[PDB]
Swiss-Prot record, chains A, B:
The active site is at H30 (charge relay system), D52 (charge relay system), S104 (charge relay system). The record marks Y78, N111 as: Involved in dimerization of the capsid protein. Residues 4-148 form the Peptidase S3 domain. The lineage of its organism: Viruses, Riboviria, Orthornavirae, Kitrinoviricota, Alsuviricetes. It is found in: Virion; Host cytoplasm; Host cell membrane; Host nucleus. The very N-terminus also plays a role in the particle assembly process. The N-terminus also contains a nuclear localization signal and a supra nuclear export signal (supraNES), which is an unusually strong NES that mediates host CRM1 binding in the absence of RanGTP and thus can bind CRM1, not only in the nucleus, but also in the cytoplasm. The C-terminus functions as a protease during translation to cleave itself from the translating structural polyprotein. Residues 74-84, 110-114 are annotated as: Dimerization of the capsid protein. Homodimer. Homomultimer. Interacts with host karyopherin KPNA4; this interaction allows the nuclear import of the viral capsid protein. Interacts with spike glycoprotein E2. Interacts with host IRAK1; the interaction leads to inhibition of IRAK1-dependent signaling. Disulfide bonds join C4-C19. Residues 46-51 are annotated as: Interaction with spike glycoprotein E2. This is Capsid protein. Forms an icosahedral capsid with a T=4 symmetry composed of 240 copies of the capsid protein surrounded by a lipid membrane through which penetrate 80 spikes composed of trimers of E1-E2 heterodimers. The capsid protein binds to the viral RNA genome at a site adjacent to a ribosome binding site for viral genome translation following genome release. Possesses a protease activity that results in its autocatalytic cleavage from the nascent structural protein. A motif (Nuclear export signal) lies at residues 35-45. It comes from the Viruses.
Amino acid sequence: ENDCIFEVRHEGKVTGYACLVGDKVMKPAHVKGTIDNADLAKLAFKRSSKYDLECAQIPVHMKSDASKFTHEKPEGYYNWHHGAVQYSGGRFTIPTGAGKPGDSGRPIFDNKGRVVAIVLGGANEGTRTALSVVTWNKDIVTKITPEG
Amino acid sequence: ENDCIFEVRHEGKVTGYACLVGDKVMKPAHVKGTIDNADLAKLAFKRSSKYDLECAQIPVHMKSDASKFTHEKPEGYYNWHHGAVQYSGGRFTIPTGAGKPGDSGRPIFDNKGRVVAIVLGGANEGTRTALSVVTWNKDIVTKITPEG
């Protein structure tokens, strides 16, 4: 279920990942290069003026490839490319050394395959890396749409 | 699932409902009067300059009363105070005449008890009322928070 993750490439090297989630193509703003997909490379991205993120509207023909997301993040273990991610005290952590070059933009999933966060970075805390992420909290309740 | 709904009252009449959802107390802006709850009545509400809605930050001691919400709205039937609400073609509808005075601000729930919309109003379509609602779509993906 990684029809929603696309490599970003600069000088023929993977610098990071773009992710189809909800109705957006999301990519960390610091990740240099262009997305390894014709359709996505053409898009105009809007860079957040607060957060290390840029997003473009998903092409409607690729909506079925987008992953679902959720703000529901109960404490416990989550999934990513390199194995288990612990969520505890409002922080995602991994074993130090589980990380690899090019992890910026990789999503973290629950067992239903919903994206709960996107990895931007990390910092060492002893035998663990604390991931720097973007995530969705209860405050997404403010982004309402009127229907009817 | 009614610990999160509070009457709004003006000159001794219920004009509508306020709803605890996510981390917000939500109320339609058109509903006059004050919430029948001391804690909520004291709060400062921010009125949306586009939508018929105002919201205040939930008091932390009442967070356990807030309903969960979701943007996931598959087609079919949902729950509200007056019975079944059909969701179909992006519109919530009810039997004409299911509505009662003071329905502004009532939530619509799925069977897991998550709020999928808040009722603002309605218009007639034959033997049905098409509800005017606020709801959460996939575009809530843009309201990210950095953690770590």
